Amino acid sequence: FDEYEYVFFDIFDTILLRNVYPEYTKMIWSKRMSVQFGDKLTAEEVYQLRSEIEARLCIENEQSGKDKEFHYMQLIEQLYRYFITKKIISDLSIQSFYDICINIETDVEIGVQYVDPHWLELVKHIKSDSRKIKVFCVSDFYLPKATLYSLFDYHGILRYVDEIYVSSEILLTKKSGRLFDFILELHKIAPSNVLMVGDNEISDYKVPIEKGMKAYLIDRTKQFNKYAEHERIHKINTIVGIESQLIKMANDFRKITPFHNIIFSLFYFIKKLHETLVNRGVKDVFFLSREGEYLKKLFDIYQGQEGFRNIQTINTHYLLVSRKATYLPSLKPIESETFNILFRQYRKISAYDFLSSINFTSDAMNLLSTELAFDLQRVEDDFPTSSTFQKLMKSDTFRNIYERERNEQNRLFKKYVDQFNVDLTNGMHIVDVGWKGTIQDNLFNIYNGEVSVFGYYLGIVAAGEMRPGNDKQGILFSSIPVMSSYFGVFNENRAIYEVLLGASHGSAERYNFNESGKIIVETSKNQREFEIYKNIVQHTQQAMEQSFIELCSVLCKKSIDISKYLEIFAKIHAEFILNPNKQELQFFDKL
């Protein structure tokens, strides 16, 4: 050994290593900023704008008596110029625009960074035994010192470091050597009492040796080869071999569970849905029972696999709703209600069917049938023109129970929603499989049009009562206004989505309070639907969760627009709908 008072460590590719090549973090930040601001600019246009500004400040700071370097606030101030002149931002000051910027990049770095385990035992040795050595960090970088304080604290290594010196705070670099002149002068260090340790031969050895310090150059040929082949594959707008990679990933999953490969469609839905919610500025989203239980499960996972930590993170809830629970409170007063939504698909029904669809109780059913001398069980060929329907509409007992239970369920459901701590002032944002968005039409009526409702569906084949304030969206496929690209692929045999997206509980029936006044949603326990999930759907739901993670490690933390490869997902989907092999068909009939 010699005898050093200070050990100076380079940061990047010395202490912190990246899963991606270092330039890819500005591309990922570019894609996430393009989603952040309304897709006004593409992921590549914001990235080109960052390049043009970064190399601009380098040349400008160079010939201002400073060194070739830029502070992060200088980049953000210029970005605020282009954004506000091109009308990309609105109601956004410079300070809040900086917050979104620095939080995307801080989460981006956190997602791909990892500390060198060799550096950990090393810095532990330095910070232990007995003789007291101080540990500094000198890095040529653009992020503020407070940002690298955050990263080191998050990695749990800031306890071994005593100072952090970044070229962005004083705009002096290790390359020019002036940053060394500043640290040695301020701290009053004798050069020969410093051991510099880094990966660059110029900035971490040649210049330190010239300044009088002892230096050690560690080898990174194995780490920079990993960056070399990763840059071969991941560019700003493409990933080479992504088609064969997905298709190969789709050949080995097929025997896991029957119809295991719709998980690729669900990943496209989850990834494009998230872009749409963040683009719309959505902070709260509701997943509808019961098909939405597994959809929320995958959406909560996805945000965790993308590294969303402090920005572009969405709170998700679970709204216990069913067609039956949401239709009654949405109706008009009996003087105007025609029940057309119920009569457009069901006509050959019984009074028991009708009184259950408008969600009457068995006591009301056992009183109306008993009072009006009709059979509750008897099914009619045309109920809207039936005698029993004409009897009910005229009966005052019906007319009493109708107004009482329509206004109560409306009051009880609305206070059930208030328990979720969501401000419907900006809008109620809902996600489901759908096809039609029936429940959404009910929800919008329940609030009497005072609440803007936004629907986001896996697929949409029927518009229903779409109108201003009642908006619907088909993420994977839609027929509004026109059929979207590859409509026939995902619409064909679309029943498998309802099968594989079963929930663990019963269907939502009605709303009432518990003991204290808090609203409890009663569910109908259908024993055979419970057995289907427990013994079949639940197992395949968790087997697809694992293949969903592997799709995440290949498609999360990238700069790609997922919509550019919908054809690849349409390809994979068709290979088991246009040719579903052997027993997969018999599994479909069982449930």
576 binds, among Cl ion, Mg ion, none (CB under 5 to 8 A by kind): none
97 versus 205: smaller Cβ distance to Cl ion = 205
| Helix, coil or strand: residue 21 | coil
Q: How far is the CB of 580 from Cl ion (least distance, A)?
A: 55
Nearer to Mg ion, 10 or 306 (CB): 10
Nearer to Mg ion, 205 or 454 (CB): 205
CA distance 39 to 191: 52
Tokens of 265: 């469609």
Binding test (CB under 5 A) with Mg ion, winner from 13, 105, 109, 291: 13
Binder to Mg ion among 10, 105, 284, 405 (CB under 5 A)? 10
- Residue 170 CB, shortest distance to Cl ion, in Å, is 15
When CB distances are held under 5 to 8 angstroms depending on the partner's kind, the choice from Cl ion, Mg ion, none that residue 109 binds is none
Nearer to Mg ion, 202 or 379 (CB): 202
- Cα–Cα distance measured from residue 591 to residue 500, given in angstroms and rounded to the nearest whole number: 9
Q: Is 214 in a helix, a strand, or coil? A: strand
Q: With binding defined as CB under 5 A, does residue 293 bind Cl ion?
A: no
Tell me which residues in 366-385 interact with Mg ion (CB under 5 A). Answer: none
Is residue 140 part of the contact set for Cl ion (CB under 5 A)? yes
Is 42:58 a contact under the CB 8 Å cutoff? Answer: no
User: Which residue type occupies 301?
Assistant: I
Instruction: By CB under 5 A, tell whether 67 contacts Cl ion.
Output: no
How is residue 179 written in tokens? 């940053």
3-state SS track over 170-206? HCCCCCCCHHHHHHHHHCCCCHHHEEEEECCCHHHHH
User: Which among 166, 270, 230 is positioned nearest to 28, based on CA atoms?
Assistant: 230
> Looking at beta carbons only, is 28 or 250 nearer to Mg ion?
28
Q: To the nearest whole angstrom, how small is the minimum distance from the Cβ of residue 579 to Cl ion?
A: 54
**Which lies closer to Mg ion via its Cβ, residue 13 or residue 284?**
13
Contact partner, 13, from Mg ion, Cl ion, none, Cβ < 5-8 Å per class: Mg ion
Span interacting with Mg ion, options 11-19, 87-95, 162-170, 455-463, rule CB under 5 A: 11-19
Known binding-site residue numbers for Mg(2+): 10, 12, 199
Q: Which span (9-17, 64-72, 280-288, 481-489) binds Mg ion, by CB under 5 A?
A: 9-17
Within 234-291, residue ranges assigned H as helices are 242-252, 263-279
- CA 354 to CA 285: how far, in whole Å? 32
CB of 31 to Mg ion, least distance (A): 19
Size of the site for Mg ion (CB under 5 A): 5
In the complex with Cl ion, the residue whose CB is nearer, 16 or 422, is: 16
Here's the x/- map for Mg ion, 64-103, by CB under 5 A: it reads as ----------------------------------------
Q: What are the two backbone dihedrals, phi and then psi, of residue 414, each rounded to the nearest 5 degrees?
A: -65, -40
Max Cα separation, the chain? 106
Of 304 and 384, CB closest to Mg ion: 304
**Do 61 and 69 form a contact (C-beta atoms < 8 A)?**
yes
Let me know if 387 is exposed, middle or buried by CB neighbors in 10 A (0-12, 13-18, 19+).
Answer: exposed
Q: Measured from the CB of residue 307, what is the shortest distance to Mg ion in angstroms?
A: 9
Instruction: Identify which of 83, 153, 81 has the alpha carbon closest to the alpha carbon of residue 115.
Output: 153
Q: Is residue 12 close enough to count as binding Mg ion by CB under 5 A?
A: yes
Residue type, 219: D
Q: Which does 140 bind (CB under 5 to 8 A by kind): Mg ion, Cl ion, none?
A: Cl ion
296 close to 54: Cβ distance less than 8 angstroms: no
Task: Tell me how far, at minimum, the Cβ of 224 lies from Cl ion, in Å.
Answer: 13
- Residue that the structure tokens 């810095």 belong to: 123
Q: Which residue in this structure is represented by tokens 């069917």? A: 353
CB of 113 to Mg ion, least distance (A): 7
Of the CA atoms within 13 Å of residue 263, those in its CB half-sphere come to 31
Helix (H), strand (E), coil (C) string for 361-382: CHHHHHHHHHHHCCCCCCECCC
Binding residues: 10, 12, 199
Q: Choosing among Cl ion, Mg ion, none, which partner's interface includes residue 69 (Cβ < 5 to 8 Å by kind)?
A: none
Whichever of 11 and 433 has its CB closer to Mg ion, that residue is 11
How many residues are given for the chain? 591
CB nearer to Mg ion: give 13 or 109: 13
Nearer to Cl ion, 46 or 171 (CB): 171
Alpha carbons 409 and 519: distance in angstroms, whole number: 11
> Smallest distance from the beta carbon of 119 to Mg ion, in angstroms?
12
Which residues lie below 8 Å from residue 494, measured CB to CB, with a gap of 6+?
Answer: 435, 459
Span interacting with Cl ion, options 137-145, 312-320, 415-423, 506-514, rule CB under 5 A: 137-145
Integer Cα distance of 444 and 327 in angstroms: 11
Give the 3-state DSSP-derived string for 471-503, with helices as H, strands as E and coil as C: ECCEEEEECCCCCCCCHHHHHCCCHHHHHHCCC
Round to whole Å and give the CA distance between 507 and 380.
26
Stretch that binds Cl ion, among 99-107, 140-148, 308-316, 459-467 (CB under 5 A): 140-148
Q: Which x/- pattern, by CB under 5 A, does the window 96-115 give for Mg ion?
A: ------------------x-
Residue 562: exposure state from Cβ atoms within 10 A (0-12, 13-18, ≥19): middle
Nearest residue to Cl ion, using CB?
140
Least distance from Mg ion to the Cβ atom of residue 488, Å: 40
Least CB distance from residue 120 to Mg ion, whole Å?
15
Contact flags string 193-212 toward Mg ion, x per CB under 5 A? ------x-------------
- Binding marks (x or -) toward Cl ion, 97..136, rule CB under 5 A? ----------------------------------------
Find, among 295, 345, 284, the residue nearest to 317 by Cα.
Answer: 284
Q: How far is the CB of 463 from Mg ion (least distance, A)?
A: 44
Rounded distance, CA 352 to CA 476, Å?
37
Binding site residues, Mg ion, CB under 5 A: 10, 12-13, 114, 199
Binding site residues, Cl ion, CB under 5 A: 140
